[PDB]
Amino acid sequence: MVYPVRNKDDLDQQLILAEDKLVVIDFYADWCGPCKIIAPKLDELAHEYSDRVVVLKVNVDENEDITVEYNVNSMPTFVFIKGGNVLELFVGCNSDKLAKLMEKHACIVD
Amino acid sequence: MVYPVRNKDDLDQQLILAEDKLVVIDFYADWCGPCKIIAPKLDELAHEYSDRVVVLKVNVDENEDITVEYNVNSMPTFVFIKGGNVLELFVGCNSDKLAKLMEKHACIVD
Ligand SMILES: [Zn+2]
Ligand SMILES: [Zn+2]
Ligand SMILES: [Zn+2]
Ligand SMILES: [Zn+2]
């Protein structure tokens, strides 16, 4: 399952506890159609990769600070992180690419 | 000669332009003794096989994304690729094996 981020200090802690794991952060809002469509597949991947991947979820309406720090301008946006380093940024609704990007490292509103 | 990779999109383009050729990617860093020793022999082979083999070079300190995607954990590491497929992975400093592996398909830091 996908862990909601309450604030920047929550997220900063999660990034350190993730250790060597792949971290994937999903920026979403409740008013975003494409966000809702891809969300089941993201939860499916989180179970398949639970030993290797940590999956975080940032609600942009309550987290303006985290959104500005990651330069999020569109939704959905998935940031792939390992060791506090941003490896790759991915915007859009292709859930087949999302699943592929998750295995290699283990439509658009606003 | 050996072509430096600037990013993942650079590398992805190189993999397609290489066509049917053998591609060899060398993962290295400036702080890696064994990397520096084998490097002349790699350049020698690149000239001998210039019509058949494309030789790419990825600096791991500036390319965390490519390193994670190829699961690089040590140096030097040579990935042998043909058609976007990874045929073989080779870690270590034996330049005689490197030359042999190059002809069949045409010490350790971190
Ligand atoms: Zn569950
Ligand atoms: Zn030359
Ligand atoms: Zn990547
Ligand atoms: Zn082979």
Side-chain angles (χ1 to χ4, degrees):
Chain A
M1 225 171 174
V2 183
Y3 170 96
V5 170
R6 192 59 220 116
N7 64 34
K8 180 225 207 316
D9 296 293
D10 197 8
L11 166 71
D12 295 329
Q13 196 191 30
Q14 292 312 117
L15 292 188
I16 302 285
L17 292 168
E19 293 180 60
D20 62 310
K21 284 161 151 187
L22 176 62
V23 179
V24 166
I25 315 170
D26 169 31
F27 292 84
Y28 82 103
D30 289 323
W31 47 264
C32 159
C35 302
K36 299 185 190 302
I37 300 160
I38 199 159
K41 159 59 82 171
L42 182 71
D43 197 68
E44 195 170 45
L45 293 164
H47 288 72
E48 303 180 55
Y49 288 94
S50 59
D51 56 344
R52 292 173 296 180
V53 188
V54 184
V55 184
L56 307 174
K57 156 168 83 162
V58 163
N59 186 307
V60 301
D61 287 325
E62 258 157 5
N63 284 287
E64 313 97 312
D65 183 34
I66 299 183
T67 291
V68 160
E69 294 193 354
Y70 282 82
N71 305 306
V72 173
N73 280 290
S74 320
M75 273 143 45
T77 291
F78 307 94
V79 180
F80 290 71
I81 286 156
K82 183 205 176 98
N85 264 7
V86 170
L87 313 172
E88 235 182 288
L89 199 94
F90 166 46
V91 309
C93 61
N94 184 356
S95 95
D96 190 68
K97 162 159 176 82
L98 167 69
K100 277 186 288 136
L101 286 175
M102 191 149 321
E103 158 208 352
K104 267 189 308 139
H105 296 92
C107 183
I108 289 187
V109 316
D110 172 16
Chain B
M1 225 171 174
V2 183
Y3 170 96
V5 170
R6 192 59 220 116
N7 64 34
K8 180 225 207 316
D9 296 293
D10 197 8
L11 166 71
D12 295 329
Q13 196 191 30
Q14 292 312 117
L15 292 188
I16 302 285
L17 292 168
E19 293 180 60
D20 62 310
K21 284 161 151 187
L22 176 62
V23 179
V24 166
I25 315 170
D26 169 31
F27 292 84
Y28 82 103
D30 289 323
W31 47 264
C32 159
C35 302
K36 299 185 190 302
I37 300 160
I38 199 159
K41 159 59 82 171
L42 182 71
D43 197 68
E44 195 170 45
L45 293 164
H47 288 72
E48 303 180 55
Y49 288 94
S50 59
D51 56 344
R52 292 173 296 180
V53 188
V54 184
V55 184
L56 307 174
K57 156 168 83 162
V58 163
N59 186 307
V60 301
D61 287 325
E62 258 157 5
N63 284 287
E64 313 97 312
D65 183 34
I66 299 183
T67 291
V68 160
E69 294 193 354
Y70 282 82
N71 305 306
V72 173
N73 280 290
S74 320
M75 273 143 45
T77 291
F78 307 94
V79 180
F80 290 71
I81 286 156
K82 183 205 176 98
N85 264 7
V86 170
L87 313 172
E88 235 182 288
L89 199 94
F90 166 46
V91 309
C93 61
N94 184 356
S95 95
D96 190 68
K97 162 159 176 82
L98 167 69
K100 277 186 288 136
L101 286 175
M102 191 149 321
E103 158 208 352
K104 267 189 308 139
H105 296 92
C107 183
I108 289 187
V109 316
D110 172 16

